Amino acid sequence: QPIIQFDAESWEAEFTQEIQDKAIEGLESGSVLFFPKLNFPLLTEELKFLDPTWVSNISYDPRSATLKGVEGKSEDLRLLSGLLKRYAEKTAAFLHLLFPFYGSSLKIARTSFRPVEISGRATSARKDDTRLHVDAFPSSPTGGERILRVFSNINPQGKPRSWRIGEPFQNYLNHLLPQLSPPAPGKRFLLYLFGITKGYRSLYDHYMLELHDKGKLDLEYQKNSPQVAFDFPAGSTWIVFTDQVLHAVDKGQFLLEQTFHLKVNALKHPEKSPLKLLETALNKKLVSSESFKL
Ligand SMILES: O=C(O)CCC(=O)C(=O)O
Ligand SMILES: [Fe+3]
């Protein structure tokens, strides 16, 4: 079931255990959790930010209270920081209400505001997010940790955000497995020494980047693989492990996004993670820092 719909309409909603179970089982199975009625309202003073000219996308780090990617007057940067900080706070609260099993293992990461219309985008194949992919960032290895994202469509003209959702990760990995290759010896160490990567690119991160890139260049797979097109309405929110769920965006404007990280050993079913699926498929440990279980 690629998309599981929920009725919650508040960021402070209290959930029954049954809904919590549905959410964590769905999330870990690679479903998108969809909240059609969960809107993220803006203050009147923030409405001015609903304009693409503010990008010079925009990112905020809640851990350091630092805003990047935008220039302007102090008071405007304060207002924009306040908007993204509120999105970080509300998404973090919501995830702790919905996923108590993860406890304090949820680690917030960067907040993103995306005011540029998607349908006019055109770039190199590897960063073309109209192509189905799982998330893997060449400059930012994960060391196996999960990439969990919360998304909210805040389009004020009532325009949906058009996604496509692909086949399960295990089928994607199987399709691309004959195209995977090990890294060149010493190359990842040089990327680390040279500051091209933030941290060391694990073998896991190498293979996730290969899946991401080779999947995007596989034009027959992009055209023919199983996929469902879904429009997320304005005023809706959705939650997804974007390292596991194949996704692409086709159209839309004005998105808030919050990234969280989660260690694999905090998952209810760690064997369903991309890390463990890749380690099983290649019969090897793919992250050197891995904790060892006696
Ligand atoms: O902009 C979007 O709606 C999706 C982009 C994407 O692939 C992502 O945030 O991981
Ligand atoms: Fe993505």
- Measured over the CA atoms of residue 153, residue 157, residue 158 and residue 159, the dihedral's sign is negative
Residues spanned by the domain of 49: 1-294
Backbone angles phi, psi at 180, to 5 degrees: -75, 150
Residue 201 labeled ligand binder: no
Contact 8, 97 (CB under 8 A): no
Number of independent structural domains in the chain: 1
Q: What's the CA-to-centroid distance between 70 and ligand 2, angstroms?
A: 22
Closest CA to 239 of 130, 158, 136, 148: 148
CA–CA separation, 168 and 72 (whole Å): 43
CA–CA separation, 294 and 284 (whole Å): 17
Strand, helix or coil at 103?
helix
Resolution in A: 1.6
CA-derived radius of gyration, the chain = 19
Mutate to test the pocket of ligand 1, among 249, 255, 258 (most ligand atoms within 8 A of CB): 249
Cβ–ligand 1 distance for 131 under 6 Å, the answer: no
Backbone angles phi, psi at 229, to 5 degrees: -95, 130
Q: What's the CA-to-centroid distance between 292 and ligand 1, angstroms?
A: 34
Cβ–ligand 1 distance for 249 under 6 Å, the answer: yes
Q: What's the CA-to-centroid distance between 267 and ligand 2, angstroms?
A: 21
Closest CA to 114 of 158, 161, 148, 76: 161
State how far Cα 232 lies from the chain centre.
16
Closest CA to 147 of 238, 244, 56, 285: 244
- Measured over the CA atoms of residue 210, residue 215, residue 217 and residue 220, the dihedral's sign is positive
Starting from the edge strand earliest in sequence, which strands make up the sheet with 227-232, in order? 227-232, 161-166, 247-251
Structure tokens belonging to residue 202: 């694990």
Structure tokens belonging to residue 161: 């955000």
Q: What's the CA-to-centroid distance between 248 and ligand 1, angstroms?
A: 7
Nearest-ligand number for the alpha carbon of 259: 1
Residues paired with residue 23 on neighbouring β-strands, in sequence order? none
